[PDB]
Amino acid sequence: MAVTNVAELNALVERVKKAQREYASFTQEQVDKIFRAAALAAADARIPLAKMAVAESGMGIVEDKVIKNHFASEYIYNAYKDEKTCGVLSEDDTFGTITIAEPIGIICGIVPTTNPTSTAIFKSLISLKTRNAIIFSPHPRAKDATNKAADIVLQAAIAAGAPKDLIGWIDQPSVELSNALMHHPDINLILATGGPGMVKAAYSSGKPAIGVGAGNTPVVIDETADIKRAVASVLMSKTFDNGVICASEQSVVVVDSVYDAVRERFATHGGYLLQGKELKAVQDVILKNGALNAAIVGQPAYKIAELAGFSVPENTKILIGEVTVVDESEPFAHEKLSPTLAMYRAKDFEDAVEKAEKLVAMGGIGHTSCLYTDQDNQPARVSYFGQKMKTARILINTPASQGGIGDLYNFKLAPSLTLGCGSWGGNSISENVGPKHLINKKTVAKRAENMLWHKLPKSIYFRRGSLPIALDEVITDGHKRALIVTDRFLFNNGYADQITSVLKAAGVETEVFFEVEADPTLSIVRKGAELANSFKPDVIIALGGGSPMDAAKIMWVMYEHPETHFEELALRFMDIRKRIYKFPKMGVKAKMIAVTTTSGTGSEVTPFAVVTDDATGQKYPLADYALTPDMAIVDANLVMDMPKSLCAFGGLDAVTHAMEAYVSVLASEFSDGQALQALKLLKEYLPASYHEGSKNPVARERVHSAATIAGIAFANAFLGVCHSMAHKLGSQFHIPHGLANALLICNVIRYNANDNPTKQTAFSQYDRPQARRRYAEIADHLGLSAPGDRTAAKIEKLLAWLETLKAELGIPKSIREAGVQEADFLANVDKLSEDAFDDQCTGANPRYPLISELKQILLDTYYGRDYVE
Amino acid sequence: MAVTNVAELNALVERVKKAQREYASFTQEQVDKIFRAAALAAADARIPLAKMAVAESGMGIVEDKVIKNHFASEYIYNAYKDEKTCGVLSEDDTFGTITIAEPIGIICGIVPTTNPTSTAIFKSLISLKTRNAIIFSPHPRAKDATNKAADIVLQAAIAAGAPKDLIGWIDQPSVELSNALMHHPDINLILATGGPGMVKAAYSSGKPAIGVGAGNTPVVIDETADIKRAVASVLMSKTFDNGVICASEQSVVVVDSVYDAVRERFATHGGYLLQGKELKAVQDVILKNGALNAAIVGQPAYKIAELAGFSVPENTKILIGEVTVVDESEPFAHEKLSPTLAMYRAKDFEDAVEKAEKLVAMGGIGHTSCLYTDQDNQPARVSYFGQKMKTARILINTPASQGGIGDLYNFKLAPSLTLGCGSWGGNSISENVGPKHLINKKTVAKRAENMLWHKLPKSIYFRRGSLPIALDEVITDGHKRALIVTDRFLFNNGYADQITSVLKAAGVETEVFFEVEADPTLSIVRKGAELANSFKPDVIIALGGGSPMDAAKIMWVMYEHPETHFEELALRFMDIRKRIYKFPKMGVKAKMIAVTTTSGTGSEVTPFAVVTDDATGQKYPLADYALTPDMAIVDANLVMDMPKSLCAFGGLDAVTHAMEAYVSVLASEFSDGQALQALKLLKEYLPASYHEGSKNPVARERVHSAATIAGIAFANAFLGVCHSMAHKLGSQFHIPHGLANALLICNVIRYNANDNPTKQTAFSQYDRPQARRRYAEIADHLGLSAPGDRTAAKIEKLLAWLETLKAELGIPKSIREAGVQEADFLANVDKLSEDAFDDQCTGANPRYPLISELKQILLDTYYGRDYVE
Ligand SMILES: NC(=O)c1ccc[n+]([C@@H]2O[C@H](COP(=O)([O-])OP(=O)(O)OC[C@H]3O[C@@H](n4cnc5c(N)ncnc54)[C@H](O)[C@@H]3O)[C@@H](O)[C@H]2O)c1
Ligand SMILES: NC(=O)c1ccc[n+]([C@@H]2O[C@H](COP(=O)([O-])OP(=O)(O)OC[C@H]3O[C@@H](n4cnc5c(N)ncnc54)[C@H](O)[C@@H]3O)[C@@H](O)[C@H]2O)c1
Ligand SMILES: NC(=O)c1ccc[n+]([C@@H]2O[C@H](COP(=O)([O-])OP(=O)(O)OC[C@H]3O[C@@H](n4cnc5c(N)ncnc54)[C@H](O)[C@@H]3O)[C@@H](O)[C@H]2O)c1
Ligand SMILES: NC(=O)c1ccc[n+]([C@@H]2O[C@H](COP(=O)([O-])OP(=O)(O)OC[C@H]3O[C@@H](n4cnc5c(N)ncnc54)[C@H](O)[C@@H]3O)[C@@H](O)[C@H]2O)c1
Ligand SMILES: [Fe+3]
Ligand SMILES: [Fe+3]
């Protein structure tokens, strides 16, 4: 039963550990009942413990401890009784979160002599609500009391449905014993108290800790304060337990304006101002051996002077010494737990808090500070006192001894002894301790599918003869200044009068910018914003496709936000809503209506805008749904006179826009029927549009509509990896986009079409690799294989249809065959296989390629081979 | 610039410390901008660091680190960018709370080799948002990378409005150096990572810590799971960085129902089942010297077998060994950071989680666990997996490697590396680390006045001839069974037919209980509830006063809640809403209409109900507003035949009911005008009612109304200390209440009437002692002293009026004169001076008496003296 040896300890802990494991399986009602019985047993025993605390400690006063043994039970209960601390605290079912709050284990309670019983009723009683255990290592001066404070708690818990040794205490303490308890393995936490050396040794143990320092507690009394209650509260805080209590106001800092008044008001109401010889004698007994006399602590005032060598009335509550030094040389400013007090003299407020912060900074860093002022009309002072004072508790118009243990003067403050002083003091709690610190929360995280979107430009218009019907719809009914962006071949050949012809004839002012060439550079973009910033357009228009529709919707940026650094605008990301350079909201200065005369790109719908740096020459595909065209237009009358090449490269980038959008990882049921309806039109009408041309406008139109439909697909289901390398392959060699996508898709399919790949994209919605299947759902949709095929022929037949399609469009079989030299390829292939993996298009490819696996399907194309793996 | 010495460290830290102090004074915009620049600089450098991390670490794979260096910047930013962490977080102005969130200081970042760069971009970047600093102590294998990961962060912050050495790193690390950094004083925290030994030495330093262990991560696959994604996600988690990443699924636990299926599905998709000789050879290289081979970590699978002595395809993602042992003897179950994996065989779910909990309990206690099942239709399994598994993260249908660092598969989970494992593991964080852990919150607590009340029984009726008018008002219009409580003198003398006369004549069933005598005991109460529980009344009535009206409203308790233990019902409290035994809501079975024939008590309004234990004989005044009479009645026709004594003792307890209610600490402006209007009527009409009696019914009525008015006062403004001793003085000697209150009030006034008292009640509303003034506002209200008196004569004149009043009512001058013997007083005076301080009435007396100060004004009354102090 008794504990004065190191083995008795190692036995106790075990018969305790085994209580917890039996106590942890308890419910809320089975412990809500243990919590009351232990709190009553502690309240009804408020007087005796307070007697047993003075007989043994030699300090304190009875009637002021009784407020503590009682506060530590009633004011603890009213607060932590309804705190759900057993199981599920919260359950957000929209998400998949649940907080379950298992306990922590067992604890070591390091008790002081200052508050031996309250600090025990407080920990004992709070460690039962969290379904924990605890073991006390008390102070020799108060071992009999704080251990009689737990038996009065335990013997009332076991009587309420608890085990019989859940709690434990050391009877004959030491260092060899505590240091053997704090370092015990079956312990799981340390709940300490007692100032420096204590916390310096709690954390240093090896276990966690909620140790708690302590020290000075400056209090400031400004001109705009109620010097009456400022003083009573100063005395009601020192004399309370004779200041032995922590946080008590060891030092006031008054401003000259009201010093004399305060000086007297302290005198009349039991204040002896240490004027001369008395003072020195008093600041000589305080500090013994660099520390405060361990015999003066908690003792009444008149009992101070006797040790000093003088005498004062027995009714004196306090001993005040008017001083100026605010450093360590003055022992009259350290953490004297006596009723003594230091009275400083300051010019104004700012001069005080500068002085307070200086003497909290010496012994009481982080603990608490106080202020007395107009709590309602001087909120800036407050704001200036909280932002300047490095204390975890700033107590405005409250006494510290009864506001730091806070449920009396202020609510919303966690009632507690064991007041955290923040890392400033050497403890990482920063708050009044409670049961939510003795607790191991834990979070079950159900798989949540990542949110998706089908976002387009409103006002898509599509048929032959749709320009004037559209401009005169939403543009002219509205804006007044336009900026048509296009290329020369369209400005020269009357593709841009057909649009000004309509704006003119109404009130509008046009200005065309036609210095855009294939693969636009950032130099052309600036030059376009440099113009937009002069013409100040109310709207922006973009013709052709790709180069214009990619230079314009970015010129739309530099016009509304010229501070945009392309280096940050083209930063590769991992998710498009968790973007690190969130695009600015740009639809205010001007809109970005878009027209297209080129089939494939589909840029008229999608956020993508491919441009190159003009310094490194790397195409930086940059993406955000803020640069959607805002009323795209797609008229098939601007395509019927296209050459045979641009038709192929276009309609053949659209194929690889849907192919790697039906198979992508962001694919959905919204973007999977459009991709197919595109891929089914590019099969019935694409060859015709190449051979026949304008002679079959029915086909030249569908292809134009399809290539846009893919946009609806790959605007939401981003591209795959064929573009991540086609952008680089089409830059280091100036190969066109569509021609590059054609020389890879018949070797990229068979890359992604492995159900046992080396990697995978880590997308929640992506259960497992479906690409091999997601590619056969294509063939069966086109009509390649009806009868019961292996799912591997449906692919061979998909490729075959491509090699057949790439044949009857003049597409070469390889790059070598496309105007590239093995000497210039092998050299800068490792460079653009890395710069491909670092593209934003590849973050959606189902297989998450390895640099060592793009290089291979990048050589196998130069030599017209097949990636076999 | 460089750091390979212990002094270079002590210099670095200083030029860092001085950055913080300059960085702490920064605003939100001045740091919201530092946070971006550092996150971009880290994202754009996602590839190289991943290269620099493999060249130097020898482990990992490039394309999987890049997801980390990028997650640690983008997914960190999107989450902690809007987190207010600079100043005021919250401001509840109704209360007086403000959370200001000063920073913590500077930090030591202990980095592993597993995640050298991400763990640096994560800490570096999160320590800038909290306006902190940090210093890294990296792993020798990865010193060049994680230090190149901070310069890429710092040099981008200083370029955004920051100092030039805010961050720091060690180039040539050691133990002598870290151990000298962790123990450095100017440090304020430790942000560690690296498993056991690390955290065992972080906390052991002397500073706080958020160190983070690590270990096994069981994953359970039940019958009702999607074995397809269960597997892909198992591989997508191991092969990811080659399992080197923490939290990865080191062990699966499948149930027989689907084991064979899972066994194959693992095989087809890159799973080599270690069947025979291969297995042993494989579980022989894992653990070297009791620990795992530090060369196998992060290495690919096929590179495992080579060390084992066999070979497998290069495309194998994983190495699986079907085993049964679940203890330490099997090294195939420890925290192997390799792509290896253990496959266990279980009968059913419960048999698995019992097995998982056993192998998390060995090396990975607290870190995280996983489960694959129907996340929607099997919520009990979930509930059973979270309540049973001691892990801070339970991952349902998510892969661990990409769900523990959680913003991808589940949201609402704090994205973080540095995953806390809870005290189970040896760290008191219990949660994924973030910036709110690197932060010192602090709470300004403005003085809030404690809420008060003016709560009475509705339906107070008062005039001559008010019984029948009242009973036939709300009782008969309603209830049907009554229980009149009274004493014999009223039952005998027809005071109780006057009330049944009216109930009868209507449909009601009466039963009278008249075994109540003065100073009722708990035996009489039970005997009354023992009756009420038989008659089952719909209403309760109480006549006379005190004894009945105090035994009935408690018999009202035992009737509606017979489980009430008087020991808890009479427990002294510190506040009446923070009560530790909250009374039950008792107005459902029966009401408690009350009548009174005795003036003083005023119990017909107030919650008080004085009764004695009958064992110790101590009057336990118990109080709660739940036992208010619910339609009190006060008719003056039941008093006009009272004797001369009861008139005095009554009207003279009412005096001390208002006197110590206008001066009390809970006094308010609601209860201060009633107290006076009582105290002004007991002065004009009390003497008359004594001498004349029924001959002056005008006076006999007012006194009856006044004595009730005081009830309105001291029901809300509790009594003082005259009752806390009159209850004991009237019990140890059976002196009547009013006679005791009269022999003390003319010595208690001059007790509370000291403006420099020894103590004070600690009530916020009580600025300072006003009693000396609050007693003179009385005299001036009665008419004792009009002309400009000293405020000390107004008291002498108040007392004089009392000694004069106590004279013309036959009240003796002292107790000695009242039938008490010095031999029996001096003996049991120390006993009832303590049992007075332990009364609930004294908790409202302005002076908070000392036991040594009640004894004195308790002897000074025996000898008819004056308390002088
Ligand atoms: N912040 C609070 O809530 C609070 C409450 C009470 C007291 N205090 C502070 O406590 C201090 C006074 O308490 P004291 O009078 O107990 O001084 P103290 O705490 O030095 O007394 C020593 C206590 O700490 C233990 N202790 C000391 N050094 C130790 C070590 N190296 N290893 C293990 N245990 C060790 C002893 O066993 C004993 O319990 C004052 O500074 C006061 O402000 C603070
Ligand atoms: N997601 C996207 O939005 C996305 C994806 C990939 C590539 N791109 C961009 O698309 C570009 C492709 O360029 P494109 O194929 O869009 O058009 P393009 O701008 O390459 O035009 C190429 C040539 O075709 C000419 N041309 C355009 N329309 C014509 C017409 N109707 N009649 C005759 N000649 C015409 C142009 O004048 C130019 O000389 C790529 O280079 C890249 O910048 C965008
Ligand atoms: N939970 C997480 O956030 C997380 C993430 C990744 C890895 N991990 C864990 O980290 C560990 C990785 O292995 P490691 O690379 O940590 O090897 P290791 O465990 O030897 O780490 C040693 C580290 O300890 C540091 N150190 C400083 N003072 C020390 C002292 N007094 N004693 C010992 N070490 C001291 C060294 O500088 C070195 O960096 C594994 O346990 C892994 O699970 C955890
Ligand atoms: N809850 C409160 O409001 C409150 C406050 C202070 C004290 N008290 C308690 O009230 C009790 C006092 O009871 P009381 O003194 O009010 O009366 P009492 O209950 O002592 O009994 C008074 C006696 O006087 C006689 N009596 C009563 N009414 C009479 C009448 N109308 N005519 C003739 N004789 C009559 C009866 O014999 C009766 O027993 C004490 O226990 C005291 O502690 C209550
Ligand atoms: Fe394309
Ligand atoms: Fe009374």
Coordinates of C-alpha atoms in Angstrom, one line a residue, chain A residues 160-275:
Chain A
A160 CA -19.2 4.9 -7.9
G161 CA -18.1 2.1 -10.3
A162 CA -14.4 2.3 -10.6
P163 CA -11.3 0.2 -9.9
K164 CA -9.5 0.3 -6.6
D165 CA -6.0 1.7 -7.4
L166 CA -6.7 3.8 -10.5
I167 CA -5.1 6.7 -8.7
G168 CA -1.9 6.4 -6.8
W169 CA 0.5 8.6 -4.8
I170 CA 3.9 8.6 -3.3
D171 CA 4.0 8.8 0.5
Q172 CA 7.7 9.4 1.0
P173 CA 9.0 11.3 -2.0
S174 CA 12.5 12.1 -3.3
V175 CA 14.3 12.8 -6.5
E176 CA 15.5 9.2 -7.0
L177 CA 11.8 8.2 -6.9
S178 CA 10.2 10.8 -9.1
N179 CA 13.1 10.7 -11.5
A180 CA 12.4 6.9 -11.6
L181 CA 8.7 7.6 -12.2
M182 CA 9.1 10.2 -14.8
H183 CA 11.4 7.9 -16.6
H184 CA 9.2 4.9 -16.2
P185 CA 8.2 3.3 -19.5
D186 CA 4.6 2.4 -18.7
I187 CA 4.0 6.1 -18.0
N188 CA 2.6 8.0 -21.0
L189 CA 2.6 11.6 -19.9
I190 CA 3.7 14.1 -17.3
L191 CA 1.4 16.7 -15.7
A192 CA 3.8 18.9 -13.8
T193 CA 3.7 22.1 -11.8
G194 CA 6.3 23.9 -9.6
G195 CA 8.2 26.4 -11.8
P196 CA 11.7 26.2 -13.1
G197 CA 13.8 23.1 -12.6
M198 CA 10.6 21.2 -12.6
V199 CA 9.6 21.8 -16.2
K200 CA 13.2 21.7 -17.2
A201 CA 13.2 18.2 -15.9
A202 CA 9.7 17.1 -17.0
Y203 CA 10.4 17.5 -20.7
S204 CA 14.0 16.3 -20.2
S205 CA 12.6 13.0 -19.0
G206 CA 11.9 11.3 -22.3
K207 CA 8.1 11.5 -22.2
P208 CA 5.8 14.3 -23.2
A209 CA 4.8 16.9 -20.7
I210 CA 2.4 19.7 -19.9
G211 CA 4.7 21.1 -17.2
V212 CA 4.1 24.7 -16.1
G213 CA 6.6 27.4 -15.2
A214 CA 5.7 30.5 -13.3
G215 CA 6.9 33.9 -12.3
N216 CA 6.3 37.6 -12.0
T217 CA 2.9 39.0 -13.0
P218 CA 3.0 42.7 -13.8
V219 CA -0.1 44.8 -13.4
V220 CA -0.5 48.2 -15.0
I221 CA -2.7 51.0 -13.7
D222 CA -3.2 53.8 -16.1
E223 CA -4.7 57.3 -15.8
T224 CA -8.0 56.0 -17.1
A225 CA -8.6 53.4 -14.4
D226 CA -10.7 53.0 -11.3
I227 CA -7.9 53.3 -8.7
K228 CA -10.3 52.1 -6.1
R229 CA -11.0 48.6 -7.4
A230 CA -7.5 48.6 -9.0
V231 CA -6.2 48.5 -5.4
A232 CA -8.8 46.3 -3.7
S233 CA -8.3 43.8 -6.4
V234 CA -4.5 44.1 -6.0
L235 CA -4.9 43.2 -2.3
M236 CA -7.7 40.7 -2.8
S237 CA -5.1 38.9 -5.0
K238 CA -2.0 39.1 -2.8
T239 CA -3.4 38.4 0.6
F240 CA -5.4 35.6 -1.0
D241 CA -3.6 32.6 0.3
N242 CA -1.0 35.2 1.2
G243 CA 0.1 35.5 -2.4
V244 CA 1.5 32.0 -2.3
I245 CA -0.9 31.3 -5.2
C246 CA 0.6 31.6 -8.6
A247 CA 0.0 34.4 -11.0
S248 CA -0.4 36.8 -8.1
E249 CA 0.5 40.5 -8.7
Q250 CA 4.1 40.6 -7.8
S251 CA 4.6 44.1 -9.2
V252 CA 2.4 47.1 -10.1
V253 CA 3.5 49.7 -12.6
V254 CA 1.6 53.0 -12.1
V255 CA 1.8 56.1 -14.2
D256 CA 2.7 59.4 -12.5
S257 CA -0.8 60.8 -13.1
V258 CA -2.3 58.7 -10.3
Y259 CA 0.7 57.4 -8.5
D260 CA 0.3 59.6 -5.4
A261 CA -3.4 58.7 -5.2
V262 CA -2.7 55.0 -5.6
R263 CA 0.2 55.4 -3.1
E264 CA -2.3 56.6 -0.5
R265 CA -5.2 54.3 -1.3
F266 CA -2.8 51.4 -0.8
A267 CA -1.8 52.9 2.6
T268 CA -5.3 53.5 4.0
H269 CA -6.4 50.0 3.0
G270 CA -3.6 48.0 4.7
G271 CA -0.5 49.1 2.8
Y272 CA 2.8 49.8 4.6
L273 CA 5.1 51.7 2.2
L274 CA 8.6 50.5 2.8
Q275 CA 10.2 54.0 2.8

